[PDB]
Design a protein around this ligand. Structure first.
Ligand SMILES: *[C@@H]1O[C@H](CO)[C@@H](O[C@@H]2O[C@H](CO)[C@@H](O[C@@H]3O[C@H](CO)[C@@H](O)[C@H](O)[C@@H]3O)[C@H](O)[C@H]2NC(C)=O)[C@H](O)[C@H]1NC(C)=O
Ligand code: NAG
Ligand code: CL
Ligand code: NA
Ligand code: ZN
Lengths: 188, 594
């Protein structure tokens, strides 16, 4: 059977980067022809494997990570980055083997009144381990005073909204990202 | 408490960028519409941005500036730590905002009527400004000059009196001498060894550089005066000051309109490509397409697609009221626009390079944090736009674009004609700018009492600018407030510093552009070295001190007047030869009514 790549790429709703979702790909044959012969993608950057030799290859299982970041934040979805998204939202291992795919979604993910649905984590104690996921909305304590539930001075909410307006620049427009991880069932 | 401040500054950058964008986009809909519904959205979104800035102002003042070690984080806290207009009471702030809005209104809504024809009533723009720029009748110009200062000037007199005392009450509460010291604080750098600059140092540097401008201006004043006597015989003394209503505009700020009366060699063809582009079928999009090509030739990036779609590059060609003042908008979020009712003229072609120069500055420092996305000082932004119009106005560039004929001979007289037109605009405004800001500095400092505001105003006009009033004014008039920048609460010393900056930039870029001829014939086109040399300062924004940003391009830690004199050096020697049988200088005692 064909692997359901349309359920992640052509998905209607895409998650925020802080709460990115993962989908495991088990016994099914892959079809990377769908991914390459399209001008729909903005990046399509592979690490550890090539964008062509993957057709005649087999893996134990494939993991697909999906989320949404701004244009300037796409650069952080790569091994060895230290931005806000890479450190507090989604980190890739140094020995990552896969491909990162992203495309512009200004017409569907940016509304005139401002789409504040897509969020990201701005404050967190220490950085995330590779493939770690944090959905805690606990008040970040930046000082020595206990926050005691309420925000205020030195106590900020960890999640902030992107705020995608359709008149923004390309560096501030919404981009849907799909990270395909390869682990060593799935063949071409 | 340094890491406690870094997280605080990040909660601001990711929250202010959204509120400023909503306020900027709201104010765009007003200058692009002009309705009552859109004027409220500008004020509604404006108070929310102000109220957010006030919360972050006081909550940033709890962070002791001395406790910060990393200096990039240091300058960001001082930017937020501003009480602003809120240090006044709720009644003082409403009255201060009431007079500031009332003054801007009477300036834009004030209209004078002709006593000879009472049905003919004209406001400043385009009514009175067209008279002061084209009319050759002494009484008609005297009427427009005096009616503007006797009608709308006297109404601003009681409002400007309270404006001085209320604005001083704000600055003195924020550890400043007066409101003039508050404006001079834009050039203050304090913390970096070898690049510091005090607020009092500005007064010393502006006056030191102005002494070297006196010789060039005195010869220009003597040359213009000789030509003006032929235009207004039996009205000007060959040894006295120039009447204020004969200078080319309402205030004498620019002598550009005197070119038809002061042209050195009128027989030579004028370089006005206005009719050329009209015949070549040029629209506003063609003007900006060529301006875009100019910045690409030096290595800078192109214009965003949102610029070519959301900007207002032409007249409101449908049903909407619009202010046509050319402005360059940096709304943030990568949204860069230009509002300009462009017409198929040469003056709009050069202005398109100026306004797009502002955008290239905004695009460069976009990677900097929010509080650092601005010019080095108040004069850096206008200087960047002016160096583009300097290169775009050279005959070498106009011929390469296609606006001048390829067989246009550039004689030594065509260059003196060009430099003279430049001097009427560039060097002609320097004594006016300095004298104006010097008068407000003294008023704010408390050196000019109220009972001699206008008396001391014209004593400086005669001595510094060399301009005498045509009719006597008591303290009931308020001629300085009759200018936009004075009655609309804007500092004016920025135009003096930007003038010296643009020629330091031009000389520095033309050296990187490997130019060899005169400085006024330089075009920094194709020069990736000059573009990289300029981009190295545009990317800095307000992170590095302006003394350091200026040094990254010109190699100097302070403003210098030598590049300004080198630009007009061929013209300065020509004026001395023309004034060999004329009187260079002016007597501060002659008046057209003694
Ligand atoms: C550096 O920037 C300048 C503009 O500031 C460029 O000069 C102009 O470049 C264009 C494009 O190559 C030339 O256009 C072509 O001109 C010929 C002759 O008129 C015409 O047959 C073509 O159809 C096209 O219009 C343009 O003439 C030229 N301006 C001149 C020579 O006055 C320059 O190319 C830039 N780059 C380089 C590598 O120099
Ligand atoms: C101007 O504003 C009115 C509401 O005040 C709106 O109906 C109209 O569409 C606006 N026009 C343009 C061109 O934005
Ligand atoms: Cl005046
Ligand atoms: Na005239
Ligand atoms: Zn400008």
């Amino acid at each position: 059977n064909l692997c359901p790549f349309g359920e992640v790429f052509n998905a209607t709703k895409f998650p925020s980067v802080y709460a990115w979702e993962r989908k495991k790909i088990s016994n099914c044959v892959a079809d990377y022809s769908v991914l390459y012969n399209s001008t729909f993608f903005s990046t399509f950057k592979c690490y550890g494997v090539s964008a062509t030799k993957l057709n005649d290859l087999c893996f134990s299982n494939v993991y697909a990570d999906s989320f949404v970041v701004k244009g300037d934040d796409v650069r952080q979805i790569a091994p060895g980055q230290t931005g806000v998204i890479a450190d507090y939202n989604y980190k890739l291992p140094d020995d990552f083997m896969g491909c990162v795919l992203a495309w512009n979604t200004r017409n569907i993910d940016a509304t005139s009144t401002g789409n504040y649905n897509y969020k990201y984590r701005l404050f967190r104690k220490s950085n995330l381990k590779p493939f770690e996921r944090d959905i805690s909305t606990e008040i970040y304590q930046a000082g020595s005073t206990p926050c005691n539930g309420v925000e205020g001075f030195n106590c900020y909410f960890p999640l902030k909204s992107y705020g995608f307006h359709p008149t923004n620049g390309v560096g501030y427009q919404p981009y849907r990202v799909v990270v395909l991880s390869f682990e060593l069932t799935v063949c071409g | 408490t340094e890491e406690n401040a870094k997280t605080f500054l990040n909660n601001f950058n990711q929250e202010a960028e959204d509120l400023s964008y909503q306020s900027s986009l709201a104010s765009w809909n007003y200058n692009t519409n002009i309705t009552e519904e859109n004027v409220q959205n500008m004020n509604n979104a404006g108070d929310k941005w102000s109220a957010f800035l006030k919360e972050q102002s006081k909550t940033a003042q709890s962070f002791s500036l001395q406790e910060i070690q990393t200096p990039i984080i240091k300058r960001q806290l001082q930017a937020l730590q501003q009480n602003g207009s809120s240090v006044l009471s709720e009644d003082k702030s409403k009255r201060l905002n009431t007079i500031l809005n009332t003054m801007s209104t009477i300036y834009s809504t004030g209209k004078v009527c002709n006593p000879d024809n009472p049905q003919e009533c004209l406001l400043l723009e385009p009514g009175l400004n067209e008279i002061m720029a084209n009319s050759l009748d002494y009484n008609e110009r005297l009427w427009a000059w005096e009616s503007w200062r006797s009608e709308v000037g006297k109404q601003l007199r009681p409002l400007y009196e309270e404006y001085v005392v209320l604005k001083n009450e704000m600055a003195r509460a924020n550890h400043y001498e007066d409101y003039g010291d508050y404006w001079r604080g834009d050039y203050e750098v304090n913390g970096v060894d070898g690049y510091d600059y005090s607020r009092g140092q500005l007064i010393e540097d502006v006056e030191h550089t102005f002494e070297e401008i006196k010789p060039l201006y005195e010869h220009l004043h003597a040359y213009v005066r000789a030509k003006l006597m032929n235009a207004y015989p039996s009205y000007i003394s060959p040894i006295g000051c120039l009447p204020a209503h004969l200078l080319g505009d309402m205030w004498g700020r620019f002598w550009t309109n005197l070119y038809s009366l002061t042209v050195p060699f009128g027989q030579k063809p004028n370089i006005d490509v206005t009719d050329a582009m009209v015949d070549q079928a040029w629209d506003a999009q063609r003007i900006f397409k060529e301006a875009e090509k100019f910045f690409v030739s030096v290595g800078l990036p192109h214009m965003t697609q949102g610029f070519w779609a959301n900007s207002m590059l032409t007249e409101p060609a449908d049903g909407r009221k619009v202010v046509c003042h050319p402005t360059a908008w940096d709304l943030g979020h990568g949204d860069f626009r230009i509002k300009m009712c462009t017409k198929v003229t040469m003056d709009d072609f050069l202005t398109a390079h100026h306004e797009m120069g502002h955008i290239q500055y905004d695009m460069a420092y976009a990677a900097q944090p929010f509080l650092l996305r601005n010019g080095a000082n108040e004069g850096f932004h206008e200087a960047v736009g002016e160096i583009m119009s300097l290169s775009a106005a050279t005959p070498k560039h106009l011929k390469s674009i296609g606006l001048l004929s390829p067989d246009f001979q550039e004689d030594n007289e065509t260059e003196i004609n060009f430099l003279l037109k430049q001097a009427l605009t560039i060097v002609g405004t320097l004594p006016f700018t300095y004298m104006l800001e010097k008068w407000r500095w003294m008023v704010f400092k408390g050196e000019i009492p109220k009972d001699q505001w206008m008396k001391k105003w014209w004593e400086m006009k005669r001595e510094i600018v060399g301009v005498v009033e045509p009719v006597p004014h008591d303290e009931t008039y308020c001629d300085p407030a009759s200018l936009f920048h004075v009655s609309n609460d804007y500092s004016f010393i920025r135009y003096y510093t930007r003038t010296l900056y643009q020629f330091q930039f031009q000389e520095a870029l033309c050296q990187a552009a490997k130019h060899e001829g005169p400085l006024h014939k330089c075009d920094i086109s194709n020069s990736t070295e000059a573009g990289q040399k300029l981009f190295n300062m545009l990317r800095l924004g307000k992170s590095e001190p302006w003394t350091l940003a200026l040094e990254n391009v010109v190699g100097a830690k302070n403003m210098n007047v030598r590049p300004l004199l080198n630009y007009f050096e061929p013209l300065f020697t020509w004026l001395k030869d023309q004034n060999k049988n004329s009187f260079v200088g002016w007597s501060t005692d002659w008046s057209p009514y003694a």
